[PDB]
């Protein structure tokens, strides 16, 4: 019973979805990125 | 001392209780596969 009963319901029509699996969903790879910061700075307006 | 130890009121050295794991090990999965379709198992593969 439970989720185990779905895992074992495995056959030919699952091959196109999970055979020779390429990815998982249970581990996210985050990409290391460059170091940066964002600052809001007021500009001078010329004219009235 | 007049009365020798009658042996009554005994005790048992090093009596430990039943081992109780706190980690709470994962449930064991079954050995029998899920009874899917009994007569049309593993697809049909219709032709053109």
Swiss-Prot record, chain A:
Reported modifications of this chain: Myristoylated at the C-terminus. Glycosylated; highly branched oligosaccharides. The pattern of glycosylation sites are unusual.
Induction pattern: Expressed in the late phase of the viral replicative cycle.
Disulfide bridge positions per record: none
Top-level division of the source organism's lineage: Viruses
Localization of this protein: Virion
UniProt miscellaneous comment: The viral capsid possesses up to five major capsid protein variants. They behave as asymmetric capsid components.
Similarity comment: Belongs to the NCLDV major capsid protein family.
Functional summary from the UniProt entry: Major capsid protein self-assembles to form an icosahedral capsid with a pseudo T=169 symmetry, about 190 nm in diameter, and consisting of 1680 major capsid proteins trimers. The capsid consists in 5040 copies of the major capsid protein (hexamers), 60 copies of the penton protein (pentamers) and 1800 minor capsid proteins of different types. The minor capsid proteins form a hexagonal network below the outer capsid shell, stabilizing the capsid by binding neighboring capsomers together.
Name the UniProt record assigns to this protein: Major capsid protein
Source organism (scientific name): Paramecium bursaria Chlorella virus 1 (PBCV-1)
Taxonomic lineage of the native organism: Viruses, Varidnaviria, Bamfordvirae, Nucleocytoviricota, Megaviricetes
Curated annotation (Swiss-Prot), chain B:
Domain of life (superkingdom): Viruses
Cellular localization per UniProt: Virion
Induction: Expressed in the early-late phase of the viral replicative cycle.
Domain notes: The hydrophobic region might anchor the protein in the underlying inner membrane.
Task of the protein: One of the minor capsid proteins that constitute a network internal to the major capsid proteins and outside the lipid membrane. The minor capsid proteins glue and stabilize the capsomers. Also acts as a molecular tape measure protein that determines the size of the viral capsid.
Quaternary structure annotation from Swiss-Prot or TrEMBL: Interacts with the major capsid protein.
Protein name: Minor capsid protein P2
Portion of the parent chain present: 289 to 336 of 576
